[PDB]
Amino acid sequence: DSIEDKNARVIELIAAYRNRGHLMADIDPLRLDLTLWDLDREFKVDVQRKKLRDILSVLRDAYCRHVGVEYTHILEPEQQRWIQERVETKHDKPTVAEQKYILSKLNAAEAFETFLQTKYVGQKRFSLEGAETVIPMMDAVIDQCAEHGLDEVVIAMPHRGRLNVLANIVGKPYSQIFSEFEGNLNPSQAHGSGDVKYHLGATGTYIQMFGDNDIEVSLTANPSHLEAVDPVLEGLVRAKQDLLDTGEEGSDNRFSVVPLMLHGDAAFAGQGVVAETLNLALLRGYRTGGTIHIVVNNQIGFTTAPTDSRSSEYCTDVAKMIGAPIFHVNGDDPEACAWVARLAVDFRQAFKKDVVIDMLCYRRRGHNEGDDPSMTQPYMYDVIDTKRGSRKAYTEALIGRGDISMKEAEDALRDYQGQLERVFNEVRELEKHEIEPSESVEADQQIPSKLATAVDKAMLQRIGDAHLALPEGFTVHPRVRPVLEKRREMAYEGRIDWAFAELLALGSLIAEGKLVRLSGQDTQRGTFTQRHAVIVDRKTGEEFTPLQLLATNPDGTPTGGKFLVYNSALSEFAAVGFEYGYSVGNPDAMVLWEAQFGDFVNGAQSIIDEFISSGEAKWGQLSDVVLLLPHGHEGQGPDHTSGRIERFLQLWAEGSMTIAMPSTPANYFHLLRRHGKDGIQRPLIVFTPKSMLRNKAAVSDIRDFTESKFRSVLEEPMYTDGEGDRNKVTRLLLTSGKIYYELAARKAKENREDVAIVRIEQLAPLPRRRLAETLDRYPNVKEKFWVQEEPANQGAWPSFGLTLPEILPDHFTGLKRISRRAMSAPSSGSSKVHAVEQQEILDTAFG
Amino acid sequence: DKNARVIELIAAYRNRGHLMADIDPLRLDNWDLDREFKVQRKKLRDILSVLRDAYCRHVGVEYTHILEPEQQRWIQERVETKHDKPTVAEQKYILSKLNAAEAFETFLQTKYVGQKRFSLEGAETVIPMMDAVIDQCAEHGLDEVVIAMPHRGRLNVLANIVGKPYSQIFSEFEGNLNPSQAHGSGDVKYHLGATGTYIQMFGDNDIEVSLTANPSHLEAVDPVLEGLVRAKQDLLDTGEEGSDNRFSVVPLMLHGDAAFAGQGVVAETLNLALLRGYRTGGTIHIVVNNQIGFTTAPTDSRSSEYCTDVAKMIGAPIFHVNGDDPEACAWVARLAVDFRQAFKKDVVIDMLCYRRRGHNEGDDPSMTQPYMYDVIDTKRGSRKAYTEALIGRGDISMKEAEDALRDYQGQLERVFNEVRELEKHEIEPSESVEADQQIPSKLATAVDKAMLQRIGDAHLALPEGFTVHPRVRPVLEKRREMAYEGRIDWAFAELLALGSLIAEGKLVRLSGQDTQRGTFTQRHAVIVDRKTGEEFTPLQLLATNPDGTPTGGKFLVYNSALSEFAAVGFEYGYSVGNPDAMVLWEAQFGDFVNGAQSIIDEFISSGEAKWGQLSDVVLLLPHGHEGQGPDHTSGRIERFLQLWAEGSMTIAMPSTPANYFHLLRRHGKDGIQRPLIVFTPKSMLRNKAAVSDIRDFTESKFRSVLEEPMYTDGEGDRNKVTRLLLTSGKIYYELAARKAKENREDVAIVRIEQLAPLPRRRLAETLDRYPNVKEKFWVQEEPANQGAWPSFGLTLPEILPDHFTGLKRISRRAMSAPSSGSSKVHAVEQQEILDTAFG
Ligand SMILES: CC(=O)SCCNC(=O)CCNC(=O)[C@H](O)C(C)(C)COP(=O)(O)OP(=O)(O)OC[C@H]1O[C@@H](n2cnc3c(N)ncnc32)[C@H](O)[C@@H]1OP(=O)(O)O
Ligand SMILES: CC(=O)SCCNC(=O)CCNC(=O)[C@H](O)C(C)(C)COP(=O)(O)OP(=O)(O)OC[C@H]1O[C@@H](n2cnc3c(N)ncnc32)[C@H](O)[C@@H]1OP(=O)(O)O
Ligand SMILES: CC1=C(CCOP(=O)(O)OP(=O)(O)O)S/C(=C(/O)CCC(=O)O)N1Cc1cnc(C)nc1N
Ligand SMILES: CC1=C(CCOP(=O)(O)OP(=O)(O)O)S/C(=C(/O)CCC(=O)O)N1Cc1cnc(C)nc1N
Ligand SMILES: [Mg+2]
Ligand SMILES: [Mg+2]
C-alpha cells in the first residue's frame, strides 16, 4: 500500500526468482509439462537504487529463460554472491567465429550419427541424436579448462554419444571406430577377451581454436554397469593430482587434473554409487577439487518415464547434498549450453567444488538404433517427429543473423561427410584377418627372475626407532605407548607380530622411494587396535605418523616416498572403486584398501567383478590395487567371519590376480614387498587375520625378514629347522590360514609324528611346482586331506577339490575334505556353537 | 527501507536459523525493535522472539528446500507458534523411558562386562522419541509400525519399545538357548527382530509394533523395510493399491550418522519414496547422530554439513534436535508423524547426541578422540539432567525418582536370576534347515485348456476405441492363436502362469527395469494406446470371474527405478511381508544382479538359516552367450550355485516355455517359502524350436531332467547312443540342430532344468535308459570357471559315482570376464564347443 510496504514486496519477489525461478525456466525443448504503475518506481536493492522494471527484466533473463539456476541451497554466502554476479548481469554475445565453431561441433556431432546410421543400420551405437549439444558443451568445458592453464581433463561417461565423444572430443581416429563396426581388428585391437566399442577409452591433446593453450584429454574405460565408473574416475584423477603435486596432498592448490563426469538421467537418480561418490567430493583422502557433472537428460530411461525413475523434481537433486550449484539448460540452445559449461569450470576453479549441468534434451531414436520407442512413449515421439533438431535450428539462426549462407553451411556438411566416406573406404580396403577365439592374458605380465624382498637388520631397526621418534612434548595415550615400545623391541630382538610386519613392509618401501596409499574404515588405528599408523596426542589431539619419518634419509635428503593413510567414509562400492582408480592413475604407487571385515567387500561386488578381476582382459587396463580382507572363524557371527575366498577363487582366471592367505607375519611382509617391487600391474587379494594378530605362536624372527623370501608353500618348522622325521608321516593335512596353529597345537599335544601339516599361502596362481616338490618330501603318505574352517561350499575347497586332483593327479587323486558342513551363511551366530564345530574339525583331522 | 530489511531477516532465520540452533549437546565447535512491521502488523521484537524460539533453540528446522508451498506453510504454522508444555504425567512418563533406557545399559554393563552390546548410552532419548512416534501413530488410528534399525541401542529398543522379554535377551547373553532359539545357524543378538502390541499410556488405542531382522551391512535393510511395509499396506487395502489412502503401516527407519551419509542404498531407497510401485506413504527416519563412526570423525565420513543432507533430494523436511532435550525430541517425533500423515511424505529426525562408551563396550575411544571423550566425561547424561529438572519444577522428589529406578533395577535382577536358574543345554553344532520346509506330494500345476483360452482371449479383450500399436497388435493376435492352436513361446507361457494364478486368487507382483514391455519387446504386460497413451493390462481381466465376481487375485506390474540393490531388497521384503503373494523381480540382464550382491548374500540366500525369516522371492535373470559382450551374457550361475546350501533356494535354467510355466506355477502353489532363481532366455524367446504344445500345459508337470523328444515321442533308438552330452539352457537347441544335420544317432543330449536342489533320482533314472554310453560330457557355453561346471564337475561324480566317474567338461576356456567383447569371436568360440561335442 505504502512506499515502505511496496519495497518489502520487491525483496520477496527478488528472492522468489532466485529460489524458485528455475521452476518457470524454458529448459524443456519438448515442452511437455505491487501494481503495473510501480514498474517505473525506483527501489533500494543490495546498496543501489534501481527501477522495478529493470529488477524484473534482470531476474526473468537470468532465471526464467533457457537456464534454470539452483544455488540458494548453498551454505557459503560468497558462492551465492559469485553465481548472482555472473547470472544477474548481461553477458556479452559470442563472436561470429565462435558461433561458426559451435555449429562445426553440432555438424560433426549430427553427421557422425547419420553416417553410422547409413553404413551400419543394423548395429547399435547409442546415438546422441536429439542431444548433439553435448559436443559443443564438452568442448567449452575443455577449452575453459585450457584457458585456466590446467594440465588434464579426465572423462568418464556412459553409452549415450560415447562414440561421438571419442571421435569429436577425445580425438580417437575414425578409422579405429569404423574397424570395430567392420569387425576387422588387428592383433593389438583383438588382444584379450575385449569389450564393446561404447565402453572403450582414449587419450589425446586438445588444442585451443581461439587460444594458445593445450590440455590433455583422457576418457577412461567402463563396464555396462551405469555410474559404477564414478569413484574410479575420482581415484584416477586423485592419483594424477598427487603425482603432479597439485591438490590436497600437493604444494599448489591448483587441482590441475579435472574430472568431467557424464551421466544419464535415469542412472543419476537411481544408482546409489552416485551419492557415495558425491559424498567423497570434500574428504581429505578423496577430494579432487570439484567434479564437472554433465547429465544428458533426454527425459527417458529406455522405456521408463522419469515419473517411475525418481521421487524428485530433477534427476540432479541428489547433488544438492554437497552444496553443488545446479544449472538446468535447454539442449536446443547451444550458446546457453556453452556459456553454462564455461561458468561451471570458473566456479570449480574459484571454490574447488563440484558443479552439475543438467542438459535437458531428448533421444531422437529408440533406446538403441533397433528399438521402436512409440510402443511405450507414443506422445513423446509424436512431439519429437515435429522437432527440427539443434543442428538445423542453429544453422537457420546463423543464416538469419547473416553469419553464413545456405551454400557455406551445405559445403561445410559435405566436407565433413566427404572426409568420413574417404576414411570408411580405406578401412574397407584393409585385408580381413582370420577370426580366432579370445586368448588368456596370463603371459602378458611375466614374473621377474630372482627378485629380492629381504631387508637389512638396520632397516627393521629404523622402522622400530621411528615409532619412538616422537615430536617434542608429544603425549602418547597410555595404551598406545606399549605398542610403540614393543615395536622397537621387536625390530631389535625378534618375535615380530602381524601388525608390525605390515608396517615394516610399507615403511621399507617408503624408504626405497615408493608412494604408499593405505585406506579403509578405521584403518589409521585399525579395527582390532593393532595398526596405530597414526597416533593421536592424548592432550592436544595432534597426529603423529611414524612411517612418514622413513620418507627422509638419515642425512636429511627425501627418499621420494610418502605415506598416505586415511580413514575412509562408511562406503565399500565408492572406496574400492576409488582405490582401483588410484592404482590405474599411478601404477608406481602401493595402493592398499582395507575392509573392516572381509564380509563387507560384497558391497563393492560390481567393482570386484567389473574392474578388479576383469579390467585387464576387457580393456588392457592394469591395476595393482591391494584388497586386505579380515577373515577367520572366531565365533563373531556370519558377518564377522568370511571374506568369501571361494568367490575370489571363482573369479580368478588367466593369472589376473594374486590371492593369498598368509599364516606368518614375515610371509605377509614378503608378499607386500614382492607386490610393490615385482612390477606386475595385477591386483592382490589378501585374506588377513583378526585373533591371529595377537597369537603368541604367529610371530617371526629377524632372519625371516633379512634372509628369507615369499614362500607360497610352508612346511612345519620341525622338518625345515627342527629334528622332525618326514618319513614317519602317513597322513598329510593340507591347509591355509590360522587353523594351522590349532592343528599344530593338537599334533604337539598328542605327539602325532605320523601327521604333517602343509600350508598353501598363495591360493591363486596355484604354486603347482612348489606344492608337488614339498609333497615328494613325505614318501610314506597313504592319505591326504584338505582341512579348512569354512563350510564345505565355502573357503578354498570348491576350487581346490576340483583343480588339485586335475593339475596334480599323482599327488591328489582321492583327496578328501575336512571342514564345516555346507552352510547358507558363512558361520553360526553363537560363539559356543562355533567352538564345538571347530573342535569337530580338529578331532576329525586327527581321528 | 526498514520493512524490507525485516523480510530478509525473517527469510534468514527460516532458511539458515538451523545453523545457529543449540542442537549439539557436546558444544564442540565455537530502536526499531519497538516499531511495527507488516507480516498482520507485528513489532520487530515479537517477530525476532518467534524466529529465535522456533529456529535457534534445541530444534534446527530445514524445510525451505521443499517445493510444495502448502508443506512450508504447514511446518511454519506448527513451528512458529507457542507450543504447550507436556503435562506432569507426560513428563514423568518421558523420565520413566529415560530410566528404562539407561538402567537397562548399566545392568548389562554390571552383569556381562565382557560381552559387546553396542550401548545407546549418551543417546537414551531415542527410547522416549520412538515411543512418541509409535504413540502418535496409534493416535492417528494406524494399524502397524514396522522398525528397521542398526546395532546402536538395538537390545534397548527390543526390550523397552518392541516388548521382547528380558528373559529372552539375557538368555542370549548367558548363551543358554532352547531348541527353538538354537534352531538354524543363527545370528548375533543385535540383528534379531521381534513383534508386539503397543498400548497407549494416556490413550485407548493400540498398534502393532514389529522390528525386522538384518545383517551387519549397515543400511542394507532400508529397502527391505519399505518392501515389507508396502506388502502389508496392499494386504490391508490402504495406500497406492488400496480403496483408502491411509498408508496405515508406518516404516520407522533408524540410522547411524556415518552409515546414513556413506551408504549408497540410502539414496536408492529415498528415491523409491514417491514411486507408484514402491511408495509407502512416507517413512519416519531417525538418525542416532552420536557425531562418530567407530574411530572416524564426521569430517572423514561426509562432504556435507549434516549427515541427513541426502534426504533433501526428495523434499523431506529435516529436524535437527538436541539429544539432551527429551521434551523437544518427543515433540519433533509427534510433529514428524503428523507431517507424514498430512502429506504421505518422508520426514527425517537428526537426533544430535554422543556415544558415552567406546564403539563397542570393550573399545577405548580416547586413543583416537581424546578431546571428545574429555568433554563427554564432564557431561551428566539426559536421565540425570531430566530427573533434576523435574525435581526443580516440583513434579517429583529425589526419593520418588530413586524409588522408581530401584523398581526397574529390582525387576531386571529378578528376571536375570530366573534365567540363571534354567538348566544349561548341551551345545551342539548348527544343523541344516533343509528339512524345515517339505516338498508337497503329488502337487498338480496343470490348468484346463479353457484357462489358456481365457488368458489368450484377454489379450484381444481391448477397451472401446483402444488403438494398439501396429507392432504390438500381432503379439496379442498370435497369443490368442497360441492359446487355442499351440506352439506357445516363452513370453506367453510366463503370462499363462501368472494369469492362471491371478484367476485362482493369487496376488502377482512383477517388477524390474522396463519389465512392463520387456527388455526384448516380448512381455507386453501393459499395452499403450498409440493415440491417447492410455494403458491396458490384459492379465488384470483374470482377477474377475466370468459371472463378474472378483477372484481375489491382482496383477501388479511396474517399471522399476534404475536400481538393483534397492529394487531386489524391496522385492525380498515384499515377499516376507506377504508370503501368499507371487513376487517376481526381473533384471534387465542377469549381469546387473551383482549390484544387489549384499541382498543376495545377506537376505535371499541366508535369511532362513540366520533368522528363520522366510522369503519366496523370484529372481528372473536373462542369461545366455549371444555375442552382446561381457555385461550382456551371464547371470553368474556359478555364484548362485556356490551360495546354495541346506535347500535354501531353487535354481533353474528351463529350456522350454511349458517347463517355465510349471516352474512358476509350482513355486506359487507348493507352499515352500524359499526363493527361486530363474536364468531366463534372450534370443531363445524367439526360437521357433523353443515352443510348447497345449498338452504340456494341461496334462504335464515340471520336468527337472529333459530328454530329446525323438526318444520320448519320436522314432529315436536310445540303445544306439554311445556318447552322452549333459547340458542346461539354450545350447541344447544348437547341439540338437548339429545332431540332426549330421544324423548322429550315437549322441544324446540330456537337459538339467533344475540345477539346485539336484534331481539326483530323476537324473540317474534318465541315464539308465542309455545302457551303451561309453563316455559322458558336461557341455556348457560358459567359461570353465563359470556356469554349472564349478559345482557339477565336483558334486556329480560324488553323488552319482556309478554314472559320473570320469565325466569330462566341454566349454569355453576359464575367463576373467563372462565372455568376449566381439560377436564374431563369440561365434567362433561357440562353433568350437559344438565341434568338440561331436568330434
Ligand atoms: C598375478 C599372476 O597370477 S601372474 C602368474 C604367472 N602365471 C604363469 O606363469 C602360468 C604358470 N603358473 C605357474 O607356474 C604357477 O601358478 C606359479 C606362477 C605360482 C609358479 O609355480 P611355483 O613355482 O610352484 O610357485 P613358487 O612360489 O615356487 O613361484 C616361484 C617363483 O615365482 C614367483 N611368483 C609366484 N607367484 C607369483 C605371483 N602371483 N606374483 C609374483 N611373483 C610370483 C615367486 O616369488 C618365486 O620367485 P623365486 O623363484 O625367485 O623364489
Ligand atoms: C528349495 C529346496 O531345496 S527344498 C528341497 C528339499 N530337499 C530334500 O528333500 C533333500 C533331498 N533332495 C532330493 O530329493 C532332491 O534334491 C530333489 C528334491 C530335487 C528331488 O530329486 P528328484 O526326485 O531326483 O527330482 P524330481 O524333480 O523328480 O523331484 C521329485 C518331486 O519333488 C518335487 N520337487 C523337486 N524339487 C523341488 C523344488 N525345488 N521345489 C518344489 N518341488 C520340488 C518335484 O516337482 C517332484 O514332485 P512330484 O512327486 O509331484 O512329481
Ligand atoms: C537400464 C539400462 C539403461 C537405461 C538408461 O537410462 P539413462 O541413464 O536415462 O540413459 P540413456 O537415456 O539411455 O542415455 S541403458 C543400459 C545398458 O545396458 C547400457 C548399454 C551398455 O553399456 O551395454 N541399461 C542396463 C543397465 C541396468 N543396470 C545397470 C546398473 N547398468 C546398466 N547398464
Ligand atoms: C563401519 C561399521 C560401523 C561404524 C558405525 O558408524 P555409525 O553409522 O555412525 O554408527 P554408530 O555410531 O556405531 O551408532 S559399525 C559396524 C558394524 O560391524 C556393526 C556391528 C554389527 O552389526 O555387527 N561397521 C562395520 C560395517 C562396515 N560396512 C558396512 C556396510 N556395514 C558394517 N556393519
Ligand atoms: Mg535418459
Ligand atoms: Mg555414529
From Swiss-Prot, chain A:
Observed phenotype of the null mutant: Cells lacking this gene do not show any ODH activity, in contrast to wild-type, demonstrating that this protein is part of a functional ODH complex in mycobacteria.
Activity regulation info: Alpha-ketoglutarate dehydrogenase and decarboxylase activities are inhibited by unphosphorylated GarA, and allosterically activated by acetyl-CoA, the main substrate of the TCA cycle. Both the phosphoadenosine and acetyl moieties of acetyl-CoA are important for activation because neither CoA nor the synthetic compound S-(2-acetamidoethyl)-ethanethioate (which mimics the terminal acetyl-phosphopantetheine group of acetyl-CoA) has an activation effect.
Gene Ontology CC entries for this record: cytosol; oxoglutarate dehydrogenase complex
GO molecular function per UniProt: 2-hydroxy-3-oxoadipate synthase activity; 2-oxoglutarate decarboxylase activity; dihydrolipoyllysine-residue succinyltransferase activity; magnesium ion binding; oxoglutarate dehydrogenase (succinyl-transferring) activity; thiamine pyrophosphate binding
Residues the record lists as binding acetyl-CoA: 658, 674, 709, 712, 762, 769-770
EC number: 2.2.1.5, 4.1.1.71, 1.2.4.2, 2.3.1.61
Cofactors: Mg(2+); thiamine diphosphate
The family this protein is said to belong to: Belongs to the 2-oxoacid dehydrogenase family. Kgd subfamily.
Subunit relationships: Homodimer. Interacts with the FHA domain of unphosphorylated GarA. The 2-oxoglutarate dehydrogenase (ODH) complex contains multiple copies of three enzymatic components: 2-oxoglutarate dehydrogenase (E1), dihydrolipoamide succinyltransferase (E2) and lipoamide dehydrogenase (E3).
Protein name in UniProt: Multifunctional 2-oxoglutarate metabolism enzyme
Organism, scientific name: Mycolicibacterium smegmatis (strain ATCC 700084 / mc(2)155)
